[PDB]
């Protein structure tokens with residue numbers, strides 16, 4: 001029920017100057033195949049909900065996985081997309097993207113743009129003149145060493161950690177004290193909010209060891225919706241989650257995520273949500289009422305074989321998770 | 325002889341609201357900076373420098389007044405170096421590199437927040453394309469962290485790979501960094517992507533190395549080979565170099581290069597016969613910029629906050645002593 005897709009990254013310039021890809025993707029068979037030994041070899045094979053080869057562009061990812069998810073958010077559902085995988089495989093690439101070099105494109109037209117910018121820009125486009133009044137708010141909550149950080153609040157620095165509490169009102173919910181929600185009033189406000197995030201992230205990285213590889217980041221967008229004739233109320237939420245790299249100090253949230261998934265697929269009565277910040281904040285995305293997808297990202301380099309195999313096995317198990 | 329300038333940064337968002345009151349007064353006409361060390365009724369310390377720039381100073385004021393006269397020297401065939409020195413948080417990177425105005429408001433070559441490096445490269449092409457000059461520009465970015473050396477512009481190697489340094493056998497007191505890449509910049513439409521590539525590699529450097537942005541020293545080098553032909557058919561072959569150095573934060577891991585830089589300045593001001601250039605990577609790379617044949621400037625960056633009093637005094641004292649260093653043959 002949880003939707004699991006595989007994305008392979010392409011080779012960097014250093015791998016050319018010349019590397020052989022050990023990963024073969026077959027989208028129509030929806031399968032990924034890894035070469036483990038070597039004219040004559042052994043291979044490992046996995047079927048996923050969708051597979052995306054090294055030639056896949058950002059627009060292909062958005063149109064195939066995000067577009068249907070965003071339609072469901074607009075319908076009034078909560079959705080979550082995780083990116084999972086080894087550092088270096090394209091978790092941030094997929095979730096955020098990058099800017100094309102030399103100011104070639106405006107941010108809205110940049111084909112290297114990832115899920116977060118494309119989504120924000122499309123919400124405004126989809127709801128431009130249907131019967132739906134709406135507002136958009138975003139937050140970016142991050143977890144490093146089991147501490148909480150607000151990367152969007154422009155009035156306090158990143159030494160300041162946030163406090164998490166059980167929410168009495170709705171069970172299995174939490175309240176993050178001091179977490180800021182920025183109203184995104186229109187498309188022309190999006191980019192600078194994203195820039196503020198990047199700036200504060202650069203501060204985080206100088207103060208915290210391997211921040212960009214070791215932190216989990218949860219970019220949340222909330223769409224409040226109202227249609228008329230009588231007022232019909234829709235609230236849509238989407239979490240865009242860029243996990244800490246899965247490579248094997250200790251990452252309690254990452255360890256706990258794995259153990260939660262294990263419990264859910266084995267149908268164990270006890271599921272250890274409370275054992276980390278990440279699984280408490282996202283418990284509804286794991287066997288709850290939220291529609292969830294996982295993008296498992298992998299490398300094509302034979303160097304990365306073991307971690308590529310670990311990610312695939314991990315992601316494949318997760319296919320068996322049921323929610324809603 | 326080494327020219328020392330002070331740049332006070334403005335107050336940020338978080339302090340203007342806390343109604344922050346500057347302990348720092350800048351008097352550019354009198355080339356002076358005044359610090360309230362006591363704090364209606366106060367005590368003050370006063371320093372005269374070669375140039376002083378208050379909180380109101382823009383990037384273009386810095387360029388026009390300090391950089392354009394030095395670049396003219398580089399175009400003439402001299403080697404020149406500019407250092408930024410000061411506490412983390414004071415504007416060393418803002419001064420040397422600049423930032424982007426938010427929301428894609430401007431192109432890179434018109435951005436008011438652009439710093440020394442992009443302004444210089446844009447202008448080299450502007451200055452030498454205008455008159456009659458065949459020229460070539462080569463750039464390199466060498467960074468020192470934990471006394472190891474990194475090439476932050478090589479787009480064919482990652483930052484695990486540190487370079488080796490050697491004495492240059494022929495020209496005495498020079499150095500050879502093995503493997504350091506020089507990237508030719510053919511035109512001004514090629515500047516921005518190269519700068520971006522450096523920023524990308526820095527991001528990875530920061531992930532791998534603790535407090536990389538605060539603890540590293542970076543040397544951005546520009547080399548201009550010029551074949552000017554005058555209107556009378558006179559041909560000049562000139563080669564100029566400019567090193568734009570963003571030093572590690574001066575606040576009080578030992579930083580051998582930062583420690584050695586201070587001791588080199590002490591030796592050169594007290595006129596001591598032995599100058600400990602050889603005691604660090606930085607002072608070996610830049611030894612000619614410290615009592616050598618290179619014309620050098622230091623830009624000391626400082627904060628207006630009363631909270632930063634002790635480090636602000638430290639910076640000013642450090643920078644003021646540097647005024648007494650002579651170079652050039």
Ligand SMILES: Nc1ncnc2c1ncn2[C@@H]1O[C@H](COP(=O)(O)OP(=O)(O)O)[C@@H](O)[C@H]1O
Pocket residue numbers: 008009010056085086087088089090091092093094098245297
């Ligand atoms: N699909 C892709 N297309 C082009 N480049 C990619 C792709 N995926 C990853 N990369 C490159 O690989 C590098 C590492 O990707 P990144 O997103 O930072 O990985 P991670 O977030 O998993 O550590 C980046 O420089 C990025 O440009």
Ligand SMILES: Nc1ncnc2c1ncn2[C@@H]1O[C@H](COP(=O)(O)OP(=O)(O)O)[C@@H](O)[C@H]1O
Pocket residue numbers: 332333334381410411412413414415416417418419423573625
């Ligand atoms: N002259 C200035 N004008 C406006 N903002 C500045 C100035 N100098 C520094 N800042 C701001 O203060 C912060 C610290 O700047 P930065 O260059 O990172 O300091 P350093 O490199 O010395 O640690 C940045 O957010 C920067 O935008």
Ligand SMILES: Oc1cccc([C@@H]2NC(=S)NC3=C2[C@H](O)CCC3)c1
Pocket residue numbers: 095096097098099100107108110111112113114116117194195198
């Ligand atoms: O092509 C892009 C268009 C818009 C945004 C993005 C990236 N994504 C996100 S989330 N934040 C940031 C991005 C930029 O690279 C750097 C600034 C922050 C790429």
Ligand SMILES: Oc1cccc([C@@H]2NC(=S)NC3=C2[C@H](O)CCC3)c1
Pocket residue numbers: 420421422423424425432433435436437438439441442519520523
């Ligand atoms: O306004 C700017 C115009 C051009 C360049 C710059 C900055 N400076 C230098 S050296 N590198 C980089 C800058 C950018 O902000 C980010 C990319 C790298 C600012």
Ligand SMILES: [Mg+2]
Pocket residue numbers: 091092093212
């Ligand atoms: Mg990443």
Ligand SMILES: [Mg+2]
Pocket residue numbers: 416417418537538
């Ligand atoms: Mg800096």
